[PDB]
Amino acid sequence: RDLYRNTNTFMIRTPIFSIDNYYEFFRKDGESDKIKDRLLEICNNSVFREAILVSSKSLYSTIIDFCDGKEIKKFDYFLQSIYKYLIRMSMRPTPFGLFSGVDFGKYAEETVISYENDNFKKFARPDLEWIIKIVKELEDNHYKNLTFKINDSIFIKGERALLIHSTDKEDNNRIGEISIRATKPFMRTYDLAKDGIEYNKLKYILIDEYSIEDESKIDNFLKQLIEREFLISNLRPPLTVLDQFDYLINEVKKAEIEIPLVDELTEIKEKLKLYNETPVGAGEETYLELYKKMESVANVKNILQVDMKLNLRDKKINKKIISDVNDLMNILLDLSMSIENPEPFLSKYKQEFIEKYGQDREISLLEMLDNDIGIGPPMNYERPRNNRSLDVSVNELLDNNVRDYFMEKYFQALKTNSRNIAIRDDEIKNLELQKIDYENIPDSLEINLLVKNKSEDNLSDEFQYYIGPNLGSTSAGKSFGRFSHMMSEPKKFFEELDERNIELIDSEEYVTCEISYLPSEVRNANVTRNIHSSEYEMSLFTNGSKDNLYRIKLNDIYIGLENNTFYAKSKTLNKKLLLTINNMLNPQTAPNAIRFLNDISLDEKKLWYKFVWSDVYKDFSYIPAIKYKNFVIMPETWKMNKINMKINKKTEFNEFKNQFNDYRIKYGVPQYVYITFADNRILLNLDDEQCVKILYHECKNSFNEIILNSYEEEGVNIVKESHKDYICELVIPLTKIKQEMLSSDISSLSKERVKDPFDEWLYIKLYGISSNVDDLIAYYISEFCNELVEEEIISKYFFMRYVDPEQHIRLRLNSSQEKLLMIYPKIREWLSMIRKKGLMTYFSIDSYDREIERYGGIELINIAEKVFFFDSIVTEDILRAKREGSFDFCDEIIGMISVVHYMESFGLPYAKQVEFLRSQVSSSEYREDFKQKRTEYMKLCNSNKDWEGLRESEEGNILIEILNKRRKIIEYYGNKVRENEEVSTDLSILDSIIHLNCNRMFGIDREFEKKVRALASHALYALKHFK
Amino acid sequence: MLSSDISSLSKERVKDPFDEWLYIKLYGISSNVDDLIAYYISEFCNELVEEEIISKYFFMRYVDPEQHIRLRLNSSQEKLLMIYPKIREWLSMIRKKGLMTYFSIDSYDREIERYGGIELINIAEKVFFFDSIVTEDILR
Amino acid sequence: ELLDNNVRDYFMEKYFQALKTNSRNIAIRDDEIKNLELQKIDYENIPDS
Amino acid sequence: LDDFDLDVKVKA
């Protein structure tokens, strides 16, 4: 069955030259060989000259000098650069500058793609660095005329206010945190400028409210706030508008500042429009005039950004291509189930979150990621690193059968001298892998494909697909975002994507939100300009396109765990957020907050281009192509190391050449390969190409990503201009087909939650008790603590067993601070006496962190702490009686009786008990044979009358009399729990108290508790006859 | 020095909480150290020393997974129990400003053999006191 | 156990070239081990017997 | 310190 459906359109990419210009230049279509001539015959090409001008001006000047016949200094670096750019313009589809272009097609019944006469329109727009330089200058000089607003990434921690990063730089290093003292005037400003305020309106209000008496004090205060970007002006353009330059012009006109600049900007706008009308190759003179004019306003390294559009005549493809992608995705998602732990760092972070905050709380995003007041970021995050000494070892737990399956394939391929590895559906089905759930399939994806017609002998749509080097993306619309200004109507595309995303999720609880942020290196933001159709927006360090009604803030997001998967929520909206980022920004370079928000949008979803074999074959220096029907998922790859290529940094050419031919003959490297960073396609039977390769190899440590890939050397291309072939790449966006108490307001350091030592609670941890726990609890703790309770020095106590690396006992005493400090001298004597007998080693006094939300809130936990007290008394009595020999029941029988007694007294009716115990899966089959003692269990676990089946003997009578001390308090607690209306699913509390009781009686043992629950469920199920 | 006869649980080696030593660990102080030490710990502890409630103190920085400050105060058990209520107020005031999160009271395990035996450890613990004072002054 | 990467590459290349030529053995040599540039062993780490 | 003093602290 098909999992994915196509959208309304796709993208086409094609370089500016045909592949004929590549073979003609490397003396393939002509046998003549010569360094110059061809170099002069290309450097005088108009299209080549302009394409170089738009990208590298220095090389353009050097080309002009060379054409003038002047003395070129190097002439080696010159030749290498010219060769690399010519190869890129002929053979690399990826769009950049005037080297390559983009267009948008449609699906149909037949494939026809053709070129029009008027190709290659230009789309020139000012760079972001230029605009930001102008904006900063304006707001530095004319701040008095501007309107300012508060930054959305601000975080107030105690008496300091912080930002996640800074757009500026410290000397020559980035700024990872700026903190200022959050004084009273700062808070007043933080309230006034919440949604925008004029400079004078704020300044005079502050002067009125403080009287300062020195105006230069307020001016410096506000200027210091503005310089550090705590206040954002209205001149700064959004990244999610369709035109940043027009927005800036309108804003400066509104402010009425720097009149000379306003007319100059309009002149630049007018000139910039003319350049967009010239054909490619004819705009050299206009570009220079425009560049000279623009550089006079603000001189920066990057001034103009240029893109071009193919403008094809026909752009249809056969809709059969969507079936093949579905087959590929079926097999790729089937294999994904062989890896058990695909995200180890996030899986560890979930455990840290659960250990710290439990599962019934929602924690602020910025507090959670803080090193001091949180748990820090995951252990692989590079922006502020976790300063804790945790273990970073990780293991993805690949299945052994699949690992063996992929090694036989490699061995067979080597033995038979085959160049490819073919995987098949029937072979994968024999591995008996687990099935994937509809909840783990990603909602949308994109895939990059190079399509080549299999053969011209039949004139038929037999297509051969090669997955592109980048493999696509994890969401539909990420690749299309950058080109929003070139689409005919971009809104309809993103509106459809948003509608489909909403269709796939439960409504009335979710909203869509777009994350936009302006990095420190504003050069990286040129790819972040894009449109979106999400309902809300969060813009950091820039203005937003939305009204203040649809504005989100970083200090408003709250994180939680539901079904063991993270989610984000907005406190003000009370809606969960469905976060989107419609651009190819690399998360790993972003701050921790942005990177974390990106991660949890893919939480528990399989990543389709994380291949299983990548870990099996990582140690090999040769890997054959991996194929599936008519897909080449991976190309054939060779890589060089110090063993097979002994190259020194001082190695001379003509010795590398002779050493490299041995490599070619030994490993069978074909004639055409890709050098897979930036130099790409290379013809190895050409001296200049090997010169390129030695220059690249020597610099790149001789191992640093020197990976050769085979060329797509079968089939023919599908895009033709008259009779010239063009290399074409498709980007196919797909969407999934649809198949049918946390509101607590207690802060983390509230006096209700954390109790300091002797703050009404004395919390003691006893170490070194492993071998004598039962005797200690039964005889020593019991007597001393009960004597304290009777004397009225403490009101109650309870204990439990835990493990922080080492095993210990946690004992908590409740009384006033004065009494707790009064009896401590006697507690020391007691513990010294206990130690002298070898029953313990040492102890500590710790802070008590109460689990308010886990036990029903602030009003009900005070009763859970009495339930714990009576349960501790009962545990002591049972252990003492068991050691004295009063009864001889096994551990399992005691556990079962205790669980049944808890459920019966809490008020859970029999109709629910078997469902309740089965809810943890334990009751399925696991201990059906172990219940071979059916009769004894059925007699003991029946609670009819007054446990009549248990009171038949003195042992059972004693056991049931010990337990009844615990009944009235549990009944009271259950009544109060079910009386509350804010508390839902009281079955969560019952499970917690049962877990605690089992821990007290038997310690840390998961398997034993599972067994006890399973046996209890089976025993209760068999008694269905007696109700 | 390996011939030491002091047992592992000897009263000379392991000191229980308030057993002539009050040993406190402060958590959540990563970002504001050199201000906590320079201004807050210094003024409170030196004031205690001048009033003769404690005879000496010293501190160090460590990491048990999480980073913290270890602060050790020396006095008799009676004075340590009498002055503790004021220490809680001090630490609450420090927390309210966001300088720390929470603390614990632990057992002091002395390194007798590392600093020359049972007669010289008592002088190493004064070397530590004066070095802590000098560190505070330099940071300030 | 932190095995060196050069030695891992050395043995993987040996195995590959053994499979390709259909040979039944892998031969290690003193001069080949010399070029790996390994650390020298101390007299205090050599087993006594 | 006065209310208008912002003790700027920067990490780099």
Author numbering:
A (entry chain B): 2 to 741, 751 to 1037
B (entry chain A): 751 to 890
C (entry chain A): 397 to 445
D (entry chain D): 2 to 13
Copied sentences from the primary study:
To elucidate conformational changes upon substrate binding, we also determined the structure of MadB in complex with the MadA variant MadL3 at an overall resolution of 3.1 Å. MadL3 compromises the LP of MadA including the first ten N-terminal amino acids of the CP. Electron density for the stretch of residues −20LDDFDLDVKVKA−9 was clearly resolved and could be built. The LP of MadA binds to the RRE element in MadB, which is present in the majority of prokaryotic RiPP classes. Substrate binding induced the formation of a four-stranded, anti-parallel β-sheet, which is a three-stranded, anti-parallel β-sheet in the apo-state. We investigated the interactions of MadB to its substrate via LigPlot+27 with standard settings, which mostly found backbone to backbone or residue to backbone hydrogen interactions (MadB-MadA: Thr184 – Asp−18; Gln225 – Leu−15; Arg182 – Asp−19 and Asp−16 ; Arg161 – Asp−14; Ser180 – Lys−12 ; Gly177 – Lys−10), but also some side chain to side chain interactions were observed (MadB-MadA: Lys218 – Asp−19; Glu178 – Lys−10; Asp785 – Lys−12). Beside hydrogen bond interactions also hydrophobic interactions could be observed for the amino acids F−17, L−15, V−13, V−11 of the MadA LP with the RRE of MadB (I176, I179, I181, P186, F187, I213, I219, F222). Interestingly, most interactions originate from amino acids of the GD, but also interactions from the ED of the opposing monomer towards the substrate were observed (e.g., Asp785). Residues 164–179 rotated by 8°, which is a prerequisite for substrate binding and formation of the RRE as the β-strand of the LP would severely clash with the loop in its position in the apo structure and thereby prevent binding of the LP as it acts as a lid closing the pathway for the substrate to bind. In the case of the ligand-bound state, hydrophobic interactions are formed with Ser154, Ile155, Arg229, Tyr518, Phe542, Leu519, Pro592, and Ile595 as well as Val−5, Lys−6, Val−7 and Ala−9 of the LP.
